[PDB]
Amino acid sequence: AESTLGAAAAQSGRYFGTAIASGKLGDSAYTTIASREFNMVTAENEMKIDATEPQRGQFNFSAGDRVYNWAVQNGKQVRGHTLAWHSQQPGWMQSLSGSTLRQAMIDHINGVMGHYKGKIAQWDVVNEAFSDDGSGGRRDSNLQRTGNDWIEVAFRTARAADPAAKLCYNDYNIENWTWAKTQGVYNMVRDFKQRGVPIDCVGFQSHFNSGSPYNSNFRTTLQNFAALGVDVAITELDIQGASSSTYAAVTNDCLAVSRCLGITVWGVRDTDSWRSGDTPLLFNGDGSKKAAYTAVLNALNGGSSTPPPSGGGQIKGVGSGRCLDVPNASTTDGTQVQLYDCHSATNQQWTYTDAGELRVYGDKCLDAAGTGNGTKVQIYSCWGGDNQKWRLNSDGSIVGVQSGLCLDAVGGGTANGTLIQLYSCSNGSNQRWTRT
Amino acid sequence: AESTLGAAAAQSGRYFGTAIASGKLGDSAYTTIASREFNMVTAENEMKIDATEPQRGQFNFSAGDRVYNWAVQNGKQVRGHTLAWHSQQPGWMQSLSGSTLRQAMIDHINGVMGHYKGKIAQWDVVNEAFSDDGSGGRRDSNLQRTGNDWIEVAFRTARAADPAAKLCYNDYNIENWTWAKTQGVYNMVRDFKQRGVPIDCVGFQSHFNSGSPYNSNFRTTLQNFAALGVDVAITELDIQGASSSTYAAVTNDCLAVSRCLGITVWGVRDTDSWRSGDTPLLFNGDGSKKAAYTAVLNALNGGSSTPPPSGGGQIKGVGSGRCLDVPNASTTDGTQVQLYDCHSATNQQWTYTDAGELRVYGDKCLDAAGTGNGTKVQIYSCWGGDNQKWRLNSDGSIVGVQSGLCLDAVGGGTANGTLIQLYSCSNGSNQRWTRT
Ligand SMILES: CO[C@H]1[C@H](O)[C@@H](O)[C@@H](O[C@H]2[C@H](O[C@@H]3CO[C@@H](O)[C@H](O)[C@H]3O)OC[C@@H](O)[C@@H]2O)O[C@@H]1C(=O)O
Ligand SMILES: CO[C@H]1[C@H](O)[C@@H](O)[C@@H](O[C@H]2[C@H](O[C@@H]3CO[C@@H](O)[C@H](O)[C@H]3O)OC[C@@H](O)[C@@H]2O)O[C@@H]1C(=O)O
Ligand SMILES: O[C@@H]1[C@@H](O)[C@H](O[C@@H]2CO[C@@H](O)[C@H](O)[C@H]2O)OC[C@H]1O
Ligand SMILES: O[C@@H]1[C@@H](O)[C@H](O)OC[C@H]1O
Ligand SMILES: O[C@@H]1[C@@H](O)[C@H](O)OC[C@H]1O
């Protein structure tokens, strides 16, 4: 099983990327993670219209190239984002309309693709052209007002500018098949393919949250578009709350569709997110892997034939054959957990939540009061602290998100009453566990 | 009164205070909450040694008086903090020792107490004089080196400077009766009382976290000290994670002790906390009441007529007589909840967690999309966002922490299938629920 997202994705011929912010590239903590985990890069803002053509006819690639250079220097491909869009247009363009805007759109496409010709894997040629008003129609923007054919023109222009790049139409809220927006976009791509309009891919931003939740029918959405003869890509993935199950579900949806090229999460750490408040990424503020990271990696690596327990379950240490136990079924915060003869008792029933917590009694969380070796692993009222979140590695180890240390049975102990602590991860049987 | 903390505590002859930071008195959002909820104020830094006597013999009461005046003008008494302490001493004092330091200590007490003579309800005369080494002995500091009798001298000095003030010894990690530090303090206070040393109160900072968790024996500690003939006060309360149950437990511990004068939480909003990372207070950064706030208020008002349910229970609407139900027991994120004939089924069993979530199925959370009226109330993977946290008002209403809006049966509906939304609280029967 591969150890990093990009490499794991590559095991199925796919890529796993992120959105890079040029201004954060001087931050070693940021780049260490980004360079290690992803093999695909999208400039978060540096290749947008305002950044690449600040004044009409004056193309500026300094910012975009800072991102591009970093990507290629570190073995990553690049997704160009984005050429035609109603948002983040430079002031001079916002003042345009009609034929003048139409030609500016065409000139912009030519200038940017010309500069990056032969260097970009995919280009989000047109972004967010459909409305969220429920009509399944076009967004009313200066671009749409130039004529309904603006999108088609953008793609034809792009094909000529760089016939080597995959041309994508990118949008959000087009993941749930039942949504009018999703179907409106489907009809457009269908029409394009039927009439010969150059389009090779559809990018699903995949910004999931309680307002626009992930739905299992996303797989049918991807299949529907793939059947039109275009590749599909998850371009700006982030999930409010970073549910491990939802992240794995989205990953498995892509792995289920042969035409799904790969997945790009919109950012590196939650603190780098445009929606940091939703802690929707795979790494938290201090750059540590979250429970969701492990779920995605597991999925990319093929997962397992035996689905993980749900609604509870024991945690038995392979070394002692004993289960994680809360002394005397106590509910006192600060109570250090131990290894004890497995038996049907709530004080041995642990639930691995999508947030990455290990709950017992329903409201008590496996908790670590410290980050160094020998830290006592105990129970404490659940509140979501990083010292209450864990990653269940495929090798059977259980690592604390905040500490990066493995649950360890003191002195390799195996007898009952053996205390559980944190300690540098090894491979010892006193650090491996089985979910029953 | 019973709608605010101070007023609710006053019903039992107690107070509920906070630590005030003079630098935030210009913040209306800050003062709106502070002036409304508390009837006791402790200067967070303005009455410390360094602040009141910048240079030997040269007293400055500008900052202290600003906090004192604000408190009194807004109907709050004041706890003086603090007269003798090893930490944060001014440069001129840190360089003193022996008899000279002893004299400085005595001079400082006379100057500060003389200035506030008869205006201070309680004074933390001596602060944190015991060690955390586990020996139960005195902390090794410049003060302790002047002679073991410095504490007694401090109290005798204080009593003379102002006999109208209650003189307290304040410390942290003295809440758990089994801890050696607690015993050391206990033995000293007992000795003082037997020898007539003028000590009227013992302040328990009450800083609870996974490293030094709340334990039910805290009530025993308070009761044991009270039995010595000294009042007790919870002086700097904050709880890592702000568990509703722990905050209510601490509140009830004070209400259970006749000598417990009141409770002071160490700050107004989590963003104002010296430990904001532990989100240990009763209000959020945006100033919204947290789940713990309601728990504390409810406790101060005399709890309920019957001990509230614990883990897994139905939530029945008063006006409809029907239960909060997840349509067809769906587990799909985004499923809007409804009212339905009550029956024993998991899709009707809700667990109110200490963090304020309302869980179903074990890892699904009552979730509000937006924050305005009409917002759909649904289920979504649990992650702890404020839109997944709720307050159980004694009046039977359920309010969302983020929105400040009440769970509402659409259009006062009462039939099966009536959808649930958020809406300005109205005390209506379509917004009232009972847990059975
Ligand atoms: C096989 O019996 C089950 C029924 O097929 C199943 O529909 C359910 O029926 C319950 C009924 O369920 C509610 C139906 O409306 C939904 O909107 C609501 O969310 C459901 O909770 O509630 C009344 C109860 O008497 C019915 O039996 O469950 C049946 C079962 O066997 O549990
Ligand atoms: C006679 O006053 C009534 C108002 O005219 C009426 O609008 C309503 O106002 C309530 C408000 O009602 C909600 C309206 O939307 C529904 O979907 C929801 O279920 C209702 O609860 O709720 C907030 C409350 O502050 C307003 O006063 O009811 C008023 C009344 O007193 O009956
Ligand atoms: O104020 C502007 C921001 O709102 C803008 O935000 C970007 C919007 O597009 C998203 O894809 C990006 O992640 C997000 O940063 O950035 C430019 C800034 O001036
Ligand atoms: O917690 C342990 C319990 O699970 C076992 O049944 O009896 C011994 C206890 O210490
Ligand atoms: O159990 C621990 C063991 O795994 C580690 O290797 O050495 C220290 C022990 O306490």
UniProtKB/TrEMBL annotation, chains A, B:
Signal sequence range: none
E.C. number(s) listed in UniProt: 3.2.1.8
Annotated active site: 236
GO biological process: xylan catabolic process
Enzyme class, spelled out: hydrolase
Protein residues bound to beta-D-galactose 1: 325, 328, 338, 343, 347
Record-linked PROSITE patterns: GH10_1, GH10_2, RICIN_B_LECTIN
Name used for this protein in its record: Beta-xylanase
